[PDB]
Amino acid sequence: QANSLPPGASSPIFGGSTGGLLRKALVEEKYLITWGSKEEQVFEMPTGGAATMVAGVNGLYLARKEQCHALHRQLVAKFKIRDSKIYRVLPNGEQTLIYPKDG
């Protein structure tokens, strides 16, 4: 609805927390990380708790760019995923890439 993934990305299985999005994601900006997993594997949320990512492309909406970057560095340091793309999402739905810029 208000937090809709791009087509091609499936949601990871998470029972939803209280560390996540607030009114700023409705009104100013939010951030979106998409990564590619080969299997279903258990990762720590940057906002508290644990989630399971399914095989395929997983997308997750976070309030800050550092939460997405910490999730990406945890995916590198534990589960060896290096194709996370971090986007900046405006409230009108315009999409821009912010990590990596170089390619």
Q: What are phi and psi of 37, to 5 degrees?
A: -105, 145
Which of 3, 54, 57, 74 touches another protein (CB under 8 A)?
A: 74
Q: Are 44 and 78 in contact (CB under 8 A)?
A: no
Closest CB to another protein among residues 57, 88: 88
Closest CB to another protein among residues 44, 83: 44
Which of 23, 80, 82, 103 touches another protein (CB under 8 A)?
A: 23
Q: Are 36 and 8 in contact (CB under 8 A)?
A: no
* Amino acid of residue 4: S
Q: Is 55 in the site for another protein (CB under 8 A)?
A: no
**Could you tell me the CA-to-CA distances from 43 to 27, 50, 51, 60, 91 in Å, in that order?**
29, 6, 6, 12, 28
Q: Is 15 in the site for another protein (CB under 8 A)?
A: yes
Q: Is 91 in the site for another protein (CB under 8 A)?
A: no
Give residues in contact with another protein (CB under 8 A).
Answer: 15, 17-19, 22-24, 28-29, 42-50, 52, 63-67, 69-71, 73-74, 86, 98-102
